[PDB]
Amino acid sequence: HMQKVEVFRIPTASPDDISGLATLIDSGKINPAEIVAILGKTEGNGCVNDFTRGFATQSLAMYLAEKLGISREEVVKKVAFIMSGGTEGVMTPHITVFVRKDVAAPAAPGKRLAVGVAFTRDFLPEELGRMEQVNEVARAVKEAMKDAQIDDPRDVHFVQIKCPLLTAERIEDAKRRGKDVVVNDTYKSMAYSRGASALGVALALGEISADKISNEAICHDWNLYSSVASTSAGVELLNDEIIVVGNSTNSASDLVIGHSVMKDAIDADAVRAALKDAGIRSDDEMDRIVNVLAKAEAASSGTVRGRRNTMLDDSDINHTRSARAVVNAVIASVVGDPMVYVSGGAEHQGPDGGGPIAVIARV
Amino acid sequence: HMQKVEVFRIPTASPDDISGLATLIDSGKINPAEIVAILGKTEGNGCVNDFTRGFATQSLAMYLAEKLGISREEVVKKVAFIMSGGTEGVMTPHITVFVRKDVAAPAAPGKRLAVGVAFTRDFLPEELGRMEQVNEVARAVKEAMKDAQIDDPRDVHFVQIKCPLLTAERIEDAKRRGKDVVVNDTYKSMAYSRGASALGVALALGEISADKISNEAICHDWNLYSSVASTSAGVELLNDEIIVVGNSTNSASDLVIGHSVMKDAIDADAVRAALKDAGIRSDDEMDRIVNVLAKAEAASSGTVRGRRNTMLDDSDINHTRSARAVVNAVIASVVGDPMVYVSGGAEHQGPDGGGPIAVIARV
Amino acid sequence: HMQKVEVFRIPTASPDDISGLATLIDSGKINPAEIVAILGKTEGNGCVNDFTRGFATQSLAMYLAEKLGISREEVVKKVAFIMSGGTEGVMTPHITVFVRKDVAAPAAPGKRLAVGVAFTRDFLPEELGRMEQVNEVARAVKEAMKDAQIDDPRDVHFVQIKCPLLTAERIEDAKRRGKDVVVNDTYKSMAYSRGASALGVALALGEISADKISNEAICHDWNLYSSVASTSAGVELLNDEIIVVGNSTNSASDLVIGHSVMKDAIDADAVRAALKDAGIRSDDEMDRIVNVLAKAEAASSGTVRGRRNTMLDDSDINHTRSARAVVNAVIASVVGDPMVYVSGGAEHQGPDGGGPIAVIARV
Amino acid sequence: HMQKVEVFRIPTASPDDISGLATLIDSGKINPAEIVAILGKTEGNGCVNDFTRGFATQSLAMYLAEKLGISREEVVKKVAFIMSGGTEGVMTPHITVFVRKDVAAPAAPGKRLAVGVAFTRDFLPEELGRMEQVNEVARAVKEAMKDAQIDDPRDVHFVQIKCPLLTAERIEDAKRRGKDVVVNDTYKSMAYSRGASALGVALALGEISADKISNEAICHDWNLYSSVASTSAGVELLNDEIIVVGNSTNSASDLVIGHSVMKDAIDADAVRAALKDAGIRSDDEMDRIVNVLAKAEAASSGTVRGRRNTMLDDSDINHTRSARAVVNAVIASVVGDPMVYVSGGAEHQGPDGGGPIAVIARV
Ligand SMILES: O=C(O)CC(=O)CC(=O)O
Ligand SMILES: O=C(O)CC(=O)CC(=O)O
Ligand SMILES: O=C(O)CC(=O)CC(=O)O
Ligand SMILES: [Ca+2]
Ligand SMILES: [Ca+2]
Ligand SMILES: [Ca+2]
Ligand SMILES: [Ca+2]
């Protein structure tokens, strides 16, 4: 007996739309008890005051609890709900449902898709963006690796994380308790939480050594980055949820995952490199895409290939919204489909101005 | 007579930045008296309350007036200043300077780049988005065609237009004169002005017959569109400025212009088709690009290739900003350069959700 | 027979925050079976893509269903949920819970607070913003009056309404059945739905005669308006929910409601007039305020007291957001409390650029 | 000889609108050679990418240069141009023209309006938000104080300052020279620049002693604040421009200035205190207002009088824009006129969440 991971990319009409998942359950294509993780793009602003993330999670947990005959708390304690807000540009709201079954297939020669889930403890507000978050996330990434039955960190192609943020109220509550936070800015606290979580991935997978990580390097030393980490902050949770996605020889999945790294926001070559790494070597094989998952960010230099842009200066549109619109459009122009996962703010995720990109594809 | 058109794509540090144009004049590469048109991307929001367009026009007219020893009003009567606001995503602020001289070189056995300029009369607020603007623009397009020495409408590849819009103050002005405007929404009035101007192009070039155009069809009948029209609305002007760009046998330019039409916002094939129509058939020949000029818009269906997006539903970001970020990113991923011209809102400019795209290239 | 209305203004930490309402129920101060209506301010953008309204309604319906031992569908059929998004400026998110019980005490001398609730039938897309909605709302307002036991329309001080809007699917469905909608714009359909609902109130209360109302007058004739109507649009419902709030001789409530009409967005005199109409005649008595409820809008003239503003020209901030922030600030400067209900878009609710304002106060 | 200060509040139709000033000059009521300072509200977003400030300054300097027969550079060396962007809510765009004459008019009984102007040297990027800017501003405030013929710092009621900010290019320059900037964020650099300049005012006027000011206290110790300072950041200048406004015994002005300090954003009592300090003691005498000038900010506590708001959490609308809309709305409700000067970001200007407010009134 081995594991078989099935992945379903489901378009949504609204944050609370569960009809697509319900159709796959009522037809028997998805056993709801075998759902291990759901990764969504919700049509909020994707920043601090984005409540479509919790709206989407509450609706899915409410639906799965009534189908499984259990409580909502038991659902959210077992299944990872990672909602990335912000569907700018042509990016299509959707959810990606990860299902894991235990089938009895012979050990075929080769690595197939594997998935592992792990949660961290709740963090205090004054712990975000600091080593407490880095070390706790690294421990959970190793836990999710064994949950996915993956030994070689080279076989990990994507580590999706949902992490907390700071609000004005939580920063006030920390000041009243005599504590200091990593940054006094709610929007900027999302970057520190994403960066600390990303460095935790690189630490766990051996991508960077521990003697290089410190509080002063977080969101400062852009030479330190993971090539597979993908982290997203949200007001709706106080801990970190980790989804490790890779390939294992002890897998009966009809899917594989490959990945690459975009050097900048318009790096279309990395998109095709990630497709080839997933077994898709031509445009005619593009129908085997299950989903594309990528990180996007505005370069700290304020330029792309020596060309100035205003993402860091635009006070009307936060730069994470612009980055999502840009990279999603780039990926959409390559694969012919805008319904792909793009998350903004790639601190320590790929180089400065770039980010990891993975492709889940049929075989 | 023998015309030679030279085109300079100049990066800008701010809306009022004239240093790049001043350097090209002081080096002798540009005779300021031969400048006929300037097409700019300014880093305002590109909608109603975008004053970077007028800031850039005033700065350029003031500089050219002092260099030429003439008044600012004589400059704006002679040189077309078309400032398209909105540099979203990775799009780089810049201006494109068109210089036309009468050289004594033989007509190479082929059509080369030609440019023609024409202005319309000022419109009253109640004329925007109606037949008065359509017929007046149609006349100016023919006027600019003979300025470009282009007889066959088949040889016209891009018609850039700057047209007015409605503000709350101008709508009140029309009411106090007993007149009603085409729409009581300032942002939506830009669409009516862009569409009426675009229909004037299609009428002048024989793309649609006049018996099919009417007030009720403007911004309603999306079957009527020009394949080369590119219109941009602005608060800083009260008339329409026309720039006809094509190829003519009476041209000694070392440049040509080709074009295609994007069927939707992610139509990368149309970008490559426009490149091939301009003589670039491989990635290695892409260094011959002078500039790429394209229209972008949110499709009225709210979808791209059957995939929903929120451009028409996002009350925080107007859909013309989203469309500019998307199509510029797509073009940038193809040509490797985000410093290209993309204008949003393509009413009657290409199909619904698409727009014409032209490339000016060296030979 | 005898009614007692209790009103609780509860601050919320997020759209899904039910802790304040839960504390009042667990302490025994609120019997959840006696809740008849909940009027909330949710911290979404208050425009088209505001999902905090459904998020807040879903959370309250989910919580009350488990406390009452009934289904969520039965809760929304029993309790009126009117969620007004947009808490701009200093406006404090909160909910206002209306409790109506049947006590066995005689009606104290004078008229005391009375509340009545009624729902309309579901509307087809082609009926919104037209006479079908006006007459249907008018019927329900008259129905809710006797449910509140109010005979004299002079004793009605506030009519809060939640009304539907048009979406891309509902518009396309109407043309599929050979019908045309009042407007092809989702945001503008919210204004027509608010205006039609407001005209239904004025018709029911005898503020305007039926011979003056027609399809052409809806959102056109700003001389026709109600002085107590307060309407708010939302995507989460297909009918109109009506809350009539007034004073009745057959009431044992310890509260009363008075009201006035703001002639413009900065009409502080109207705020003080509404306070005295509710029995508060000095600054020292402001602690008797339970809540202040007001409508806000941008004047169609684009001016306030002869002074231009940019609300109708600002493409970065929707004008309904600006209007809510202004009137909330004006009320807060008078009562010393920014936690008051202010709803935007006051079509036929007060004069053009103004709106009704009511005060619920202790006696 | 004796000085006479005349102040003109002029409504504007656009950032580049000089028609109101031209009417007062063409009528002979204003001698353009006697203009010493112009304080404007321009309808840009009032944050980083607000180019209406430079647009207004360029348009006004260009106009006054042609009227005076001198160069534009000589005008900006002579006249203070302080353009504060952001006209949110109902706030009316306008400019305030300060004219100073040497008349032979009797010394009115009392101290009357006096104005003084002074400029600092240009600051290097590493000097913004630090003691170099504080000490340099303090000297210029003393220079403008004696320029206004004001001896007692108690007679200074308003010190308006325009200060620079940091851009990506200026940060690289400081980095290339081996220097570090106070903060690596363009938007937050406006706060540090505003705070350092404000502390320079308090230092110059003796409001706080020098031993309390340091680099670590800037934008941290909110107990240190000036009660008359009003600072505004802009990209269009590299130094600080200071306008000292007060009352002097050596003045023949028909005007006086009083002031108060708003304790929070809704402190209407402070508005009335500023009116009475300026000699306006009843509602009928508010027609003597020339202009009201105030600072606004979002309190770092995220609350107003114990009531939560979303200004520090709103990722769609910058909190300085919200603060301007609120405080302008509050002042408008008191004086009945939205055309008053309100500036956002009040670091070390009044208490945390408050700001100085001054009134210029006729006598
Ligand atoms: O993932 C991103 O695009 C940025 C983020 O952390 C917040 C979110 O997704 O809601
Ligand atoms: O009531 C308002 O403030 C505006 C509206 O109609 C939609 C909403 O409530 O979100
Ligand atoms: O003065 C303000 O309102 C805030 C600021 O510094 C930037 C500006 O003025 O544009
Ligand atoms: Ca990165
Ligand atoms: Ca089009
Ligand atoms: Ca109204
Ligand atoms: Ca302050």
Considering DSSP H and I runs of 4 or more, what fraction of the residues of chain A is helical?
Answer: 25-40%
Note the total helix count of chain A. Answer: 8
Taken as a percent bin, the fraction of beta residues of chain A is: 25-35%
Strand order of the largest sheet of chain A: 1-4-2-3
Which H/E pattern describes the elements of chain A? EHEHHEEEHEHHEEEHEEEHEE
Small-molecule binders: 3-oxopentanedioic acid, calcium ion
Radius of gyration of chain A: 19 Å
Q: Looking at the chains present, what oligomeric state does this protein adopt?
A: homotetramer
Largest sheet of chain A: 4 strands, mixed
Structure class of chain A: alpha+beta
Shape of chain A: globular
Provide structural commentary.
Chain A is α+β, with helices and mostly antiparallel strands and 363 residues long. Chain A has three domains: 1-107, 2-Layer Sandwich (60s Ribosomal Protein L30, Chain: A); 108-253, no CATH class; 254-363, 2-Layer Sandwich (60s Ribosomal Protein L30, Chain: A). Chain A contains eight helices and 14 strands. A four-stranded mixed beta sheet of chain A has the order 1-4-2-3. Chain A has a four-stranded mixed beta sheet with strand order 5-8-6-7. The first copy, chain A, has a four-stranded mixed beta sheet with strand order 9-14-10-13. The radius of gyration of chain A is 19 Å and the shape is globular. The two termini of chain A are 20 Å apart. Chain A binds chain B through residues 11, 13, 43, 45, 87-93, 265-268, 304-305, 307-311, 313-314, 316-317, 321-322, 325-327, 329-330, 332-334, 336-339, and chain B through 11, 13, 43, 45, 87-93, 265-266, 268, 304-305, 307-311, 313-314, 316-317, 321-322, 325-327, 329-330, 332-334, 336-339. Bound molecules: 3-oxopentanedioic acid (3 copies) and calcium ion (4 copies). Residues 297, 346, 349-352, 354-355 of chain D line the site of one calcium ion. One calcium ion binds next to loops of chain C.
